[PDB]
Amino acid sequence: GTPAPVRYPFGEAVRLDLHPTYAELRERRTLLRVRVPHGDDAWLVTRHEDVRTVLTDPRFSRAAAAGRDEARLTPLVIRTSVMGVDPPDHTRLRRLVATAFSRRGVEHLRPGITALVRRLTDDMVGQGPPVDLVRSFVTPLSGLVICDLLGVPYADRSRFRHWLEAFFSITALPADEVAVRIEAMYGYIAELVALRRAEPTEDLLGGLVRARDRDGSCSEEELVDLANVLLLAGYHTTASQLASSLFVLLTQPEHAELLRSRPELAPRAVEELLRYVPLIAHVTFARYATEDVWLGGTLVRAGEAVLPAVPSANRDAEVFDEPDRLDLTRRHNPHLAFGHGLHHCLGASLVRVQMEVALTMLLGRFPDLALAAPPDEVPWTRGMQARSPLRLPVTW
Ligand code: HEM
Ligand SMILES: CN[C@@H](Cc1ccccc1)C(=O)N[C@H](CO)Cc1c[nH]c2ccccc12
């Protein structure tokens, strides 16, 4: 007899604020049996120590969820490519993109990103306040970076960024509208992969089709999934953390000017903005136990699902000194904004480089940068999986 399931999500995720139950649950050292919009009931994992465990312990599988009605907040189960398989499939698939995303491999992109940010703030200079930082800086920057690396025509952004938001939708779209766009995009990706047989390219997608076509290293659906997720995670998720990180600094401007006055702080400010800012609206993808695991006062049984509350982990007072204060100068930062262990975020370095350069130049070229509106009147996405302001008007 397991306890009565509580309704999760606890409520809408509002701006960057965290529901109070997360902190109560950490203090309790128990998991919470929850009942979610779709799929299985789960245990919600809130403590940094335990989200570490569920995210990478081998007794918690992420392929298991494919044989189940997966505990989730979206009406349709999303196909997560390398995010939804175990070894040996995860090792096979991740090997194909490991080096292009490495620290050394991403650093060779630093010129181009920097040239792209200069150009992006060149226009702002000429055009003058007010500016929506989202439409004029954040979306181009993460949109062009990922589209150049991956070979996806950024001229096509008018079409596919309609569909992109069907993968992120909790309550913003009906289940039939969700399924319609999801195939619209797979068709689009599947067509891109076709042209790369006709006419190979020198981008990351061009080599993935070579890898299937002459090494037989993946399935055609695994190739389309890997390609989808790499565009999903770079277009929207990168933009939302940067948008969100911009909204923080501009509402706590003594940190902006601290980072302004000390640019050598940039790698620290980037790690802290990944931790402080709750990008994940509620939880990350669920894991099913494959044998019996005891944690959070619970003997979680084989076949039962856990939901890792990454943003709660990152406020854990037993890991982070003063966890709900923004300390850009924090030196050691074992956060989980990029997950933990086996599925640790492939694009970790590309997000660091983008952020580092973007904050550094935005704050450098515009020493007067301030919001052009009351922070409470900045609008935020409603009913989506990643939290982001929809508009960031600034003046200088
Ligand atoms: C601010 C931007 C981003 C954030 C906050 C973020 C966050 C995360 C998190 C938390 C996970 C682990 C999920 C889990 O274990 O439940 C993850 C995994 C992953 N991320 Fe990201 N991500 C970002 C950008 C990107 C980009 C730009 C790419 C690639 C272009 C990317 C590709 C991936 C992939 C492929 C995985 C799965 C890795 C694996 O299964 O081995 N992400 N990310
Ligand atoms: C419970 N997934 C949520 C929360 C989340 C989890 C991880 C990162 C960001 C956000 C989500 O927004 N997932 C989004 C929308 O489904 C897509 C996504 C983000 N990172 C991915 C990595 C691989 C495949 C898909 C994604």
Side-chain angles (χ1 to χ4, degrees), residues 270-292:
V270 158
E271 295 305 290
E272 174 75 342
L273 286 159
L274 288 167
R275 166 200 103 64
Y276 183 80
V277 163
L279 189 275
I280 295 173
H282 307 276
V283 297
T284 186
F285 310 96
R287 277 82 171 158
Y288 281 70
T290 54
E291 43 185 298
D292 284 356

Side-chain angles (χ1 to χ4, degrees), residues 318-333:
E318 288 139 86
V319 179
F320 304 92
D321 296 345
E322 309 191 59
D324 297 291
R325 295 187 52 90
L326 182 67
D327 190 339
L328 298 194
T329 75
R330 202 187 309 267
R331 310 191 278 282
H332 191 240
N333 202 328

Side-chain angles (χ1 to χ4, degrees), residues 239-252:
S240 300
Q241 173 73 18
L242 187 62
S244 308
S245 293
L246 280 175
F247 170 91
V248 169
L249 297 175
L250 287 138
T251 56
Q252 295 171 58

Side-chain angles (χ1 to χ4, degrees), residues 74 78-81 83 167-169 229 232-233 237 279-281 283-286 385-386:
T74 56
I78 310 294
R79 321 166 35 69
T80 54
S81 158
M83 180 72 257
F167 293 81
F168 288 82
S169 189
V229 153
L232 267 194
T237 326
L279 189 275
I280 295 173
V283 297
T284 186
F285 310 96
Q385 289 270 84

Side-chain angles (χ1 to χ4, degrees), residues 69-92:
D69 184 33
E70 186 202 307
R72 69 189 184 272
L73 319 165
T74 56
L76 311 181
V77 179
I78 310 294
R79 321 166 35 69
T80 54
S81 158
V82 81
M83 180 72 257
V85 296
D86 296 359
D89 300 83
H90 179 276
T91 315
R92 167 169 58 83

